Amino acid sequence: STGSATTTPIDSLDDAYITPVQIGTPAQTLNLDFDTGSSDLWVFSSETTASEVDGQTIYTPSKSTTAKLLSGATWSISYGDGSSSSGDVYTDTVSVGGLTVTGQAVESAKKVSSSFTEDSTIDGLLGLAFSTLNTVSPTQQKTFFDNAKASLDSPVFTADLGYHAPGTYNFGFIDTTAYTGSITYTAVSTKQGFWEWTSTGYAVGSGTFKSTSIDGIADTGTTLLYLPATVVSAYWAQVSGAKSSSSVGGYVFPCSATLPSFTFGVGSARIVIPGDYIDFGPISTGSSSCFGGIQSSAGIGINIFGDVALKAAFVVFNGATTPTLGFASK
Numbered sequence: 001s002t003g004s005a006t007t008t009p010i011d012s013l014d015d016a017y018i019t020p021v022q023i024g025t026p027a028q029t030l031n032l033d034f035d036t037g038s039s040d041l042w043v044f045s046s047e048t049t050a051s052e053v054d055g056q057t058i059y060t061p062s063k064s065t066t067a068k069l070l071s072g073a074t075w076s077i078s079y080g081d082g083s084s085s086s087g088d089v090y091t092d093t094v095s096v097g098g099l100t101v102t103g104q105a106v107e108s109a110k111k112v113s114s115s116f117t118e119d120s121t122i123d124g125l126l127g128l129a130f131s132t133l134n135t136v137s138p139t140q141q142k143t144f145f146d147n148a149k150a151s152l153d154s155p156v157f158t159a160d161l162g163y164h165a166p167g168t169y170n171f172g173f174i175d176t177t178a179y180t181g182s183i184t185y186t187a188v189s190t191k192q193g194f195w196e197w198t199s200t201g202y203a204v205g206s207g208t209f210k211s212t213s214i215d216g217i218a219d220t221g222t223t224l225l226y227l228p229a230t231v232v233s234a235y236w237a238q239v240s241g242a243k244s245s246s247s248v249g250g251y252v253f254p255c256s257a258t259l260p261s262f263t264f265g266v267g268s269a270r271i272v273i274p275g276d277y278i279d280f281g282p283i284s285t286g287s288s289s290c291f292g293g294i295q296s297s298a299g300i301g302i303n304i305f306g307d308v309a310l311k312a313a314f315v316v317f318n319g320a321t322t323p324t325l326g327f328a329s330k
């Protein structure tokens with residue numbers, strides 16, 4: 001089997017991407033944030049505290065004839081930005097772009113943090129990291145990809161995120177028309193439950209490539225590119241007037257600047273992020289100071305190849321017995 005679904009930026013800045021998902025019988029379609037950095041499928045629901053719902057589409061398990069309460073199961077998760085959600089668990093039928101999983105754990109939110117409440121366009125998350133990270137207690141549950149992959153034509157999914165434009169998540173096949181040149185595959189460590197890999201280095205603009213190992217994760221659920229402070233300093237030094245701001249919380253730059261590209265290495269291959277992918281617009285409405293899309297990972301503990309990097313590539317998440325990651329230019 002295979003599946004294919006369009007993913008869409010939630011706003012003009014590509015702050016995140018939503019993908020329609022069919023849950024239950026009859027189908028309840030919710031727009032979920034596909035997140036290769038976590039492993040919970042959770043949704044706004046009829047159980048979510050009323051005051052914490054503001055515009056989201058909710059899942060109502062009582063109206064699904066295939067929904068079953070998972071007795072005694074709860075979940076609770078916190079994301080890298082301090083955001084959180086929690087609730088109970090159902091099993092139900094879940095379909096993505098024509099690919100169907102029966103008995104998928106659907107985690108129904110009772111509580112969500114303010115950031116989720118304030119984003120009316122995101123109805124929940126669909127985790128695509130490794131199932132070892134799933135938070136359901138006392139019995140851990142499997143991800144959508146994990147449940148589907150034995151049925152897939154090939155145990156893979158691909159992320160093809162667009163710059164200010166729609167893109168595609170495919171399951172079970174590689175669309176050879178979606179990229180240029182070849183796909184370069186690189187080793188993955190699953191020891192922390194992430195799609196963790198090691199970049200071979202970077203360049204800034206037309207500058208010479210610096211060969212250096214950068215361990216990080218491929219994370220569709222993170223907006224920006226987070227890299228070591230040395231690397232990030234080298235990038236923003238090439239932008240006149242750019243500075244790291246304490247009050248703002250990272251590098252900002254004059255909105256009139258022309259941003260240089262950023263290149264990262266995948267083995268001997270090179271993925272080039274165009275400079276305008278790194279522009280995240282005025283820090284506040286009407287400001288001439290803009291937020292940078294490359295930021296330091298120093299306070300995080302790990303480097304994160306978020307959407308800023310991934311959207312410059314066609315990315316293969318290969319879930320064979322020994323998982324690997326593939327990158328192609330497009």
Ligand SMILES: Cc1ccc(-c2noc([C@H]3C[C@@H](O)CN3)n2)cc1F
Pocket residue numbers: 016033035036037038078079080081083115116119122125219220221222
């Ligand atoms: C309001 C909001 C906040 C965070 C997230 C979010 N989704 O994926 C992630 C990254 C960071 C780490 O969790 C691994 N994946 N963060 C989504 C939101 F809609």
